[PDB]
């Protein structure tokens, strides 16, 4: 035996394929030699512990570097006129102009400007000095050490959990719902009330005095007597200055709604009340399922009894408890789908309802956060469907799942796939046709012939929320409606003030260009879903390959017979859907960035007029906004944007290098490598050296992955460079 | 400070060399 | 301004309703939805040592078998209702 | 038959009281579902045959229509009235508490019954005058009860709908409006504005 | 005689077959007892291999 | 070595054993088809995984199947 | 005023667009003799531009802040000519084409070699079938009622 230890088949490969495939199959515990279920579960547990340790170390490193090399104490005094510092630069390759150019902020040497928004987040939660950040970093280092220690302990024979413990679903659901959500959110309200709210009013509360300072003048008396309205009295005034006692109040729980007048962000007393309410809701809900105390629900009986008596769903949900409980890919897919949905929601909500002070005025940070979270959500959404296909291949049992909801989906896969195809074709046809018609109309110098369609439904929905720029006068926009009268004394004043102010990002005004780009987004989503669903459902076989389940999740082809069978596996269906995900997220981020750039420059009419034809996009977004970026270094000198131009070109080069592995396939290269072996063996003074692994071309599936990684890395780096350079050159 | 003048070369030139040598010796080993 | 000490009499009413009215319905529904099980075996009998029911807490000398868990659950419901009533007033 | 010349569903044989084969959507196909539906229909009919006297009589005595009697509870501190006399306990949280407890007991008592016949016509103590002594008269009585209940349900639907077209008005007010000028004060104007 | 008579129309009940749930015509039936798939069926449409004839057992064809 | 399997839907055409570029497959006598023959796969250590045998099979779905498996010097076609 | 829009006839930006287009066209005409053919073509272009702007003014379209017409597709009766009527006409034509294709495909399905009638069209049969699609809605609906629309 030799590397890999966990594969007898791989360890006997006489070629270089032994190393590549040894690296790529390390974390697939199910396919290792002499693997059992208990060992699988225990390895997963240890890996989770390691992941937590890595996360804690990452956060500790960020905090330590900001405390040691940043300008946090200078930024706190004048947040709007200081640039945050990420860390310092020490590059022996730098020249003197590079040393001078990157010396920005208040530093004594080259530094990097942070665009992750950690400064605003930490300032909002009450951190004020570099001593606080050092303590936080030390605490997180301790937490990482504790996580590693806990990871090592449960791999010992005395402390190994059993498989039955891992399959106790009701106890885990109860404990997670009640403590990991309810108690976790209850404690954050405590931190807010005791530390963060006093800090925003000029009060310094730390470990040495937090037992003597009352968060409220009346103490806990109102809480136990039910006089809970005393905690909302005397809120902060509109003339409040954040961080000082000028114009401050004494309330700790309010329902004002809207934004803080100065920081242009949510009130700190609204978030505490929100977290308290959700903590109570989560604490109550964690008492549903049955444990060894003799009361509660049983999930299996809940599933088995939800069958309609009409028979239109067959046997219903019977047998689904054991299907989910015995498959880990099913659980991973469900978790990934939920996580991706909530990540997209986080991205959509953070840009329009900012929570951190002075982050709405930082234009570069907002775009970076939005793009980051949207790309991550897209990748997670692809992974959900990938693991659904893996479940259908490896874990599904037809006999236990007879005629239930899961089995009837495989029965009519053709209808689902064909209807998805119809929707995609319809959307693509008409969207492209309208765009090309508008382009041709602009080309002939007659813009009045364009097809411009108002997004009436979205404008009506915006009016129903209290916006008065369209004159629809419905619901919340109606002063005499019951809905308006219900909340007019609680939250409507502040919300209506915020929604009818046009300098923020709360319910931006929309037009025909928004309509066209929204339908493009819909086309992208439908096509990606079509690809992934077709890959998942056809995983066990089709007419072209009835026995696909016998060949695994990933395999090259079934050869040139029967007309040829390239890309017939479900893995190849996942591989083709990454290109569509990247395209869709690119469209979404292009739309967001152009709209917000035009909004920030105060010339929204440019987007309104130039977004109805594709030449408008190409000329007024890409060509126009890339002038500063491509001038980072020129024959006349360099400035602080040099690194972003270099990364722009680097991303272009990495993206194009991926096309080599995607367009040219293996048999060209194995023949080319065969001549080099002869050349080396016949060369004097060099044939005294010989290899140990026989050199070979990459495998058919390897080159698909290697090409796709190059494509994604180039995409990400190029867009990140362009976005950051374009935003920071104009707005700093 | 003077610390970056040490740790940057330590992490960029010394540790990669040690790790690559050890890993190559590990992957080339047989019994 | 209703007093908080009196309003907590809702606990007594909730306990009365649980002990005299809805006892049979709750008991028969709990009997119908048995212990959770995996692969046809309960969690404890499948191998999980920490899933064993506490039989010592099931035995109560009440003539109809009223437990302490029932007391806790109905008291929690009564307290929640009473504090909702208290918070709704004085607004 | 509810429509001559139309075939009947197989499960509607014409032996049940008030059975005329009306089931275009086939909601009674499942034998367990159809048994429940008869109980629900009878309960709805019996509840609606008490509402109709309770809506017209207070309006016929000048005490206000049936939607005016609910206006006071939306206000803070509103007190209930009966026959023009305020009742001491007519506060909102006193009324809500006594209604839930009194009803939750009887309906749960009805729920625990397991004999299908007693869920519709329980008999026993609820028939003090003994009208169920004759099985021959009883069938005629059941037909009469079913035929009246559906009419009362239709009347209640009319009550509800007529309110939307004429807000703030009572059914007797609508009848008085119609009687004065039948040929212009009718449904036609509402449908075609 | 064994199985369907020649010229009759049968439908296929083999899941891994290209003509699953399709109707074909019987050509011949081998009468040897030791043969496992004695029914010869032909179809109007060709499969992915441009073949139009296949052999089936008595349990994978039914008279339509 | 790769895995080559034969199923009893075989008709004895010989076309798979004529197509193999290395001697992996051969005909043996049998009873169960008109031809009184079936393919056998005695030498799968010499299989390269080309699937020429599966392109030649006239059965609706193949009576010969090749499953790719652990790779060796012979199965990679290396003459280095 | 749906969505805060204004009629084209009252829009000043619409008139400014018309004036700019006409002025751009007129600057090219000064380069040619009035009797020459290019002058005649430019005159025709100017007249057509004026007529197009007048026609857009007459039909009751709605302009935005840029002076460009916008289409309302919510179903309002005042703008049924923008989306509803052309949509119904397109649906009729597409149903005609699809019904004719389906009828021709069914007609030749019973032949000895139906494939050869697809690469070499049988002109008389198609010509006889072409006229039949003029009443496609009635035939399709009656086929749906009789259950012959969906294959068994
Ligand atoms: C995350 C995580 C999870 C899911 C577990 C889960 C478990 N640990 Mg554990 N552990 C963790 C982190 C975690 N640990 C860390 C980080 C450390 C290092 C401090 C330890 C150190 C540790 C020890 C030293 C032991 C366990 C043991 C156990 C097992 C039963 C005892 C128990 O926790 O119930 C506690 C049950 C209760 C009723 C406590 C309720 C809390 C009261 C009400 C307050 C259980 C499988 C025990 C065992 O037998 O392992 C098999 C054991 O001896 N753990
Ligand atoms: C009170 C009891 C309790 C608690 C606290 C935990 C806690 C945990 N268990 Mg656990 N467990 C328990 C009882 C408990 N268990 C019992 C009784 C059993 C046996 C039935 C188990 C069995 C068990 C297993 C088998 C495993 C765990 C694991 C875990 C860890 C998962 C990490 C996680 O959820 O990320 C934290 C996530 C959240 C807090 C919520 C994420 C989603 C929310 C909505 C996001 C909120 C975002 C919010 C806006 C803030 C973000 C913004 C901010 C950046 C500013 C976590 C530490 C896993 C593990 O190994 O971890 C080490 C694991 O594999 N547990
Ligand atoms: C919580 C998140 C999570 C977890 C625990 C897993 C866990 C797993 N995934 Mg996975 N996956 C995820 C998210 C996740 N995935 C997402 C979001 C995607 C979409 C991008 C995928 C796409 C994906 C594919 C396409 C495949 C897996 C596979 C696997 C299994 C083997 C992993 C392996 O060999 O990698 C080893 C590590 C590497 C190869 C390094 C990756 C190198 C890349 C190019 C960048 C560096 C393992 C059970 C494999 C599997 O189960 O095969 C049957 C498999 O083929 N995953
Ligand atoms: C810009 C490049 C591009 C374009 C235009 C498309 C377009 C399309 N892809 Mg696609 N794709 C691309 C790149 C592209 N892809 C890449 C890089 C990948 C990764 C490998 C994929 C992977 C992919 C998958 C996996 C799938 C698609 C599908 C589709 C189709 C669904 C969208 C739709 O509604 O049709 C848009 C309509 C059109 C483009 C029609 C234009 C027709 C004009 C009029 C042709 C004119 C002809 C000519 C001018 C006249 C004769 C003259 C003579 C000289 C020819 C669509 C045709 C899906 C599909 O086919 O299923 C439905 C599908 O499943 N694509
Ligand atoms: C499958 C096609 C499809 C898809 C996926 C979408 C998707 C979307 N549309 Mg949309 N739309 C469609 C067709 C479609 N539309 C058509 C055909 C019209 C013209 C009537 C519109 C008109 C329209 C408007 C005016 C607006 C949207 C908007 C939106 C977005 C918000 C969701 C919404 O309001 O749904 C709307 C859903 C529908 C209208 C249902 C259409 C589905 C049917 C099956 C289409 C069939 C065509 C039908 C036969 C036409 C008959 C007309 C004939 C009598 C003349 C969402 C991305 C809104 C938005 O945010 O834009 C920025 C918005 O304001 N759409
Ligand atoms: C995952 C967290 C993380 C990350 C990404 C970095 C990243 C970096 N650190 Mg670092 N560091 C970390 C945690 C982290 N550190 C921790 C926990 C400590 C201990 C408190 C340090 C202590 C540290 C010092 C003392 C120095 C760096 C330096 C650097 C930079 C040059 C690389 C180097 O010399 O590595 C060294 C990394 C370590 C010693 C961490 C070991 C754990 C680089 C940006 C150097 C720098 O600023 O260059 C300009 C430098 O001089 N780091
Ligand atoms: C069973 C259904 C039902 C319900 C819910 C009500 C409910 C109500 N009735 Mg009522 N009523 C009913 C049946 C019902 N009635 C019947 C069958 C009759 C005919 C005898 C009446 C005759 C009647 C009169 C004459 C008056 C009311 C009034 C009222 C209102 C306040 C006092 C009262 O009677 O409380 C319900 C308690 C016992 C029925 C209340 C909304 C009073 C009113 O107008 O309120 C302002 C009033 O003056 N009812
Ligand atoms: C006139 C032309 C037909 C119009 C109706 C077309 C739909 C079919 C008939 C529905 C008539 C009907 O009630 O069908 C009921 C039918 C069967 O429901 P169940 O199996 O749950 O119950 C069956 C019992 O009601 C039988 O007694 O379909 C459904 O599952 C519900 C569909 C509507 C769901 C609505 C809520 C969705 C969220
Ligand atoms: C394949 C497969 C799989 C996977 C799957 C998936 C991945 C899916 C996804 C899915 C999804 C991803 C879904 C989603 C959904 C969503 C939703 C369903 C939503 C909803 C919403 C709502 C309902 C709302 C509401 C509201 C309110 C409340 C208020 C305001 C207004 C509104 C309307 C907004 C599994 C593993 C499982 C199994 C195997 C196979
Ligand atoms: C001996 C006896 C008797 C009596 C008895 C009794 C009297 C009992 C009682 C009992 C009780 C009396 C119980 C209680 C309980 C309670 C509870 C269980 C509570 C809970 C609570 C909670 C859960 C809370 C919550 C919350 C919320 C939700 C919010 C705010 C905060 C708080 C925390 C407050 C008699 C003579 C008759 C007979 C013979 C025997
Ligand atoms: C270029 C090319 C080759 C030839 C390329 C080879 C053999 C590259 C082999 C790797 C060399 C030595 C460069 C490695 C560069 C890495 C950055 C170093 C390792 C990094 C570690 C993290 C693994 C194929 O083998 C091939 C096979 C099938 C389809 C397409 C292609 C294809 O396009
Ligand atoms: S394996 Fe295929 S090609 Fe070879 S004899 Fe059998 S049926 Fe003929
Ligand atoms: S796969 Fe190729 S080498 Fe292997 S037995 Fe078949 S024809 Fe021969």
mmCIF file of C-alpha atoms in Angstrom, chain A residues 474-619:
data_model
loop_
_atom_site.group_PDB
_atom_site.id
_atom_site.type_symbol
_atom_site.label_atom_id
_atom_site.label_comp_id
_atom_site.label_asym_id
_atom_site.label_seq_id
_atom_site.Cartn_x
_atom_site.Cartn_y
_atom_site.Cartn_z
ATOM 1 C CA UNK A 474 -54.395 51.655 -3.150
ATOM 2 C CA UNK A 475 -54.155 50.231 0.386
ATOM 3 C CA UNK A 476 -51.271 51.856 2.273
ATOM 4 C CA UNK A 477 -51.234 54.679 -0.290
ATOM 5 C CA UNK A 478 -54.902 55.352 0.564
ATOM 6 C CA UNK A 479 -55.416 57.568 3.604
ATOM 7 C CA UNK A 480 -58.914 56.204 4.329
ATOM 8 C CA UNK A 481 -58.212 52.465 4.137
ATOM 9 C CA UNK A 482 -58.570 50.142 7.128
ATOM 10 C CA UNK A 483 -55.020 48.879 6.560
ATOM 11 C CA UNK A 484 -53.681 52.435 6.760
ATOM 12 C CA UNK A 485 -55.753 53.214 9.859
ATOM 13 C CA UNK A 486 -54.639 50.033 11.638
ATOM 14 C CA UNK A 487 -50.920 50.824 11.844
ATOM 15 C CA UNK A 488 -50.960 54.614 11.424
ATOM 16 C CA UNK A 489 -50.072 55.034 15.119
ATOM 17 C CA UNK A 490 -47.347 52.372 15.394
ATOM 18 C CA UNK A 491 -44.979 52.148 12.421
ATOM 19 C CA UNK A 492 -46.529 53.779 9.337
ATOM 20 C CA UNK A 493 -45.173 57.356 9.835
ATOM 21 C CA UNK A 494 -41.496 56.367 9.794
ATOM 22 C CA UNK A 495 -41.952 53.739 7.089
ATOM 23 C CA UNK A 496 -43.825 56.186 4.850
ATOM 24 C CA UNK A 497 -41.154 58.825 5.421
ATOM 25 C CA UNK A 498 -38.455 56.323 4.435
ATOM 26 C CA UNK A 499 -40.262 54.928 1.388
ATOM 27 C CA UNK A 500 -41.069 58.319 -0.174
ATOM 28 C CA UNK A 501 -37.486 59.615 0.090
ATOM 29 C CA UNK A 502 -35.567 59.072 -3.136
ATOM 30 C CA UNK A 503 -31.960 59.302 -1.913
ATOM 31 C CA UNK A 504 -31.975 55.749 -0.488
ATOM 32 C CA UNK A 505 -32.397 52.299 -2.048
ATOM 33 C CA UNK A 506 -35.795 51.499 -0.488
ATOM 34 C CA UNK A 507 -38.168 50.609 -3.359
ATOM 35 C CA UNK A 508 -36.400 52.329 -6.238
ATOM 36 C CA UNK A 509 -38.440 53.638 -9.160
ATOM 37 C CA UNK A 510 -38.717 51.276 -12.128
ATOM 38 C CA UNK A 511 -39.406 51.431 -15.852
ATOM 39 C CA UNK A 512 -39.265 49.467 -19.117
ATOM 40 C CA UNK A 513 -35.575 48.593 -18.771
ATOM 41 C CA UNK A 514 -36.333 47.001 -15.409
ATOM 42 C CA UNK A 515 -39.091 45.028 -17.141
ATOM 43 C CA UNK A 516 -36.769 43.676 -19.836
ATOM 44 C CA UNK A 517 -33.967 42.789 -17.432
ATOM 45 C CA UNK A 518 -36.402 41.093 -15.036
ATOM 46 C CA UNK A 519 -37.656 38.883 -17.848
ATOM 47 C CA UNK A 520 -34.051 38.065 -18.773
ATOM 48 C CA UNK A 521 -33.484 37.036 -15.143
ATOM 49 C CA UNK A 522 -36.582 34.829 -15.300
ATOM 50 C CA UNK A 523 -35.276 33.177 -18.475
ATOM 51 C CA UNK A 524 -31.942 32.447 -16.813
ATOM 52 C CA UNK A 525 -33.544 30.953 -13.708
ATOM 53 C CA UNK A 526 -35.868 28.751 -15.756
ATOM 54 C CA UNK A 527 -33.081 27.451 -17.996
ATOM 55 C CA UNK A 528 -30.783 26.638 -15.071
ATOM 56 C CA UNK A 529 -33.636 24.847 -13.301
ATOM 57 C CA UNK A 530 -34.410 22.911 -16.492
ATOM 58 C CA UNK A 531 -30.818 21.699 -16.807
ATOM 59 C CA UNK A 532 -30.475 20.693 -13.153
ATOM 60 C CA UNK A 533 -33.886 18.992 -12.962
ATOM 61 C CA UNK A 534 -33.274 17.061 -16.182
ATOM 62 C CA UNK A 535 -29.942 15.937 -14.750
ATOM 63 C CA UNK A 536 -31.461 14.818 -11.448
ATOM 64 C CA UNK A 537 -34.442 12.899 -12.859
ATOM 65 C CA UNK A 538 -32.577 11.061 -15.650
ATOM 66 C CA UNK A 539 -29.856 9.922 -13.236
ATOM 67 C CA UNK A 540 -31.023 6.302 -12.986
ATOM 68 C CA UNK A 541 -31.487 5.651 -16.699
ATOM 69 C CA UNK A 542 -33.114 6.700 -19.944
ATOM 70 C CA UNK A 543 -33.893 5.312 -23.389
ATOM 71 C CA UNK A 544 -30.316 5.915 -24.551
ATOM 72 C CA UNK A 545 -28.867 4.225 -21.435
ATOM 73 C CA UNK A 546 -31.387 2.144 -19.464
ATOM 74 C CA UNK A 547 -28.878 0.957 -16.825
ATOM 75 C CA UNK A 548 -27.168 4.247 -15.960
ATOM 76 C CA UNK A 549 -27.457 3.466 -12.237
ATOM 77 C CA UNK A 550 -24.894 0.653 -12.576
ATOM 78 C CA UNK A 551 -22.136 3.049 -13.693
ATOM 79 C CA UNK A 552 -22.223 5.560 -10.827
ATOM 80 C CA UNK A 553 -22.710 9.292 -10.516
ATOM 81 C CA UNK A 554 -19.661 10.280 -12.591
ATOM 82 C CA UNK A 555 -18.345 8.482 -15.679
ATOM 83 C CA UNK A 556 -17.015 9.737 -19.095
ATOM 84 C CA UNK A 557 -19.435 8.327 -21.750
ATOM 85 C CA UNK A 558 -20.794 4.916 -22.928
ATOM 86 C CA UNK A 559 -18.530 4.995 -26.063
ATOM 87 C CA UNK A 560 -19.199 5.920 -29.739
ATOM 88 C CA UNK A 561 -21.897 3.256 -30.325
ATOM 89 C CA UNK A 562 -25.626 3.926 -30.685
ATOM 90 C CA UNK A 563 -24.783 7.281 -32.267
ATOM 91 C CA UNK A 564 -22.299 8.467 -29.596
ATOM 92 C CA UNK A 565 -22.799 9.193 -25.890
ATOM 93 C CA UNK A 566 -20.560 12.110 -24.756
ATOM 94 C CA UNK A 567 -21.755 13.905 -21.551
ATOM 95 C CA UNK A 568 -24.493 11.348 -20.633
ATOM 96 C CA UNK A 569 -23.996 11.299 -16.852
ATOM 97 C CA UNK A 570 -25.684 13.431 -14.199
ATOM 98 C CA UNK A 571 -22.299 14.916 -13.302
ATOM 99 C CA UNK A 572 -22.122 16.246 -16.863
ATOM 100 C CA UNK A 573 -25.559 17.790 -16.329
ATOM 101 C CA UNK A 574 -24.257 19.592 -13.248
ATOM 102 C CA UNK A 575 -21.134 20.676 -15.192
ATOM 103 C CA UNK A 576 -23.293 22.315 -17.891
ATOM 104 C CA UNK A 577 -25.480 24.204 -15.396
ATOM 105 C CA UNK A 578 -22.600 26.155 -13.833
ATOM 106 C CA UNK A 579 -22.226 28.194 -17.057
ATOM 107 C CA UNK A 580 -25.928 29.192 -16.880
ATOM 108 C CA UNK A 581 -25.729 30.033 -13.174
ATOM 109 C CA UNK A 582 -22.742 32.282 -13.856
ATOM 110 C CA UNK A 583 -24.593 33.953 -16.736
ATOM 111 C CA UNK A 584 -27.696 34.607 -14.614
ATOM 112 C CA UNK A 585 -25.770 36.010 -11.648
ATOM 113 C CA UNK A 586 -23.759 38.158 -14.056
ATOM 114 C CA UNK A 587 -26.945 39.635 -15.495
ATOM 115 C CA UNK A 588 -28.330 40.292 -12.005
ATOM 116 C CA UNK A 589 -25.164 41.998 -10.780
ATOM 117 C CA UNK A 590 -24.788 44.062 -13.966
ATOM 118 C CA UNK A 591 -28.344 45.338 -13.483
ATOM 119 C CA UNK A 592 -27.790 46.168 -9.806
ATOM 120 C CA UNK A 593 -24.451 47.886 -10.389
ATOM 121 C CA UNK A 594 -25.539 50.038 -13.332
ATOM 122 C CA UNK A 595 -28.736 51.114 -11.574
ATOM 123 C CA UNK A 596 -26.910 52.088 -8.392
ATOM 124 C CA UNK A 597 -24.053 53.841 -10.222
ATOM 125 C CA UNK A 598 -26.540 55.998 -12.119
ATOM 126 C CA UNK A 599 -28.444 56.652 -8.881
ATOM 127 C CA UNK A 600 -25.307 57.697 -6.986
ATOM 128 C CA UNK A 601 -24.128 60.005 -9.769
ATOM 129 C CA UNK A 602 -27.534 61.726 -9.796
ATOM 130 C CA UNK A 603 -28.251 61.079 -13.490
ATOM 131 C CA UNK A 604 -30.805 58.231 -13.367
ATOM 132 C CA UNK A 605 -32.132 59.403 -16.743
ATOM 133 C CA UNK A 606 -29.080 57.835 -18.408
ATOM 134 C CA UNK A 607 -30.100 54.376 -17.205
ATOM 135 C CA UNK A 608 -33.738 55.068 -18.086
ATOM 136 C CA UNK A 609 -32.939 55.972 -21.693
ATOM 137 C CA UNK A 610 -29.951 53.733 -22.474
ATOM 138 C CA UNK A 611 -31.107 50.432 -20.935
ATOM 139 C CA UNK A 612 -33.693 49.505 -23.581
ATOM 140 C CA UNK A 613 -31.130 48.432 -26.208
ATOM 141 C CA UNK A 614 -28.023 46.285 -25.872
ATOM 142 C CA UNK A 615 -25.718 48.816 -27.533
ATOM 143 C CA UNK A 616 -26.732 51.161 -24.729
ATOM 144 C CA UNK A 617 -25.523 48.637 -22.167
ATOM 145 C CA UNK A 618 -22.263 47.939 -24.000
ATOM 146 C CA UNK A 619 -21.440 51.610 -24.572
#
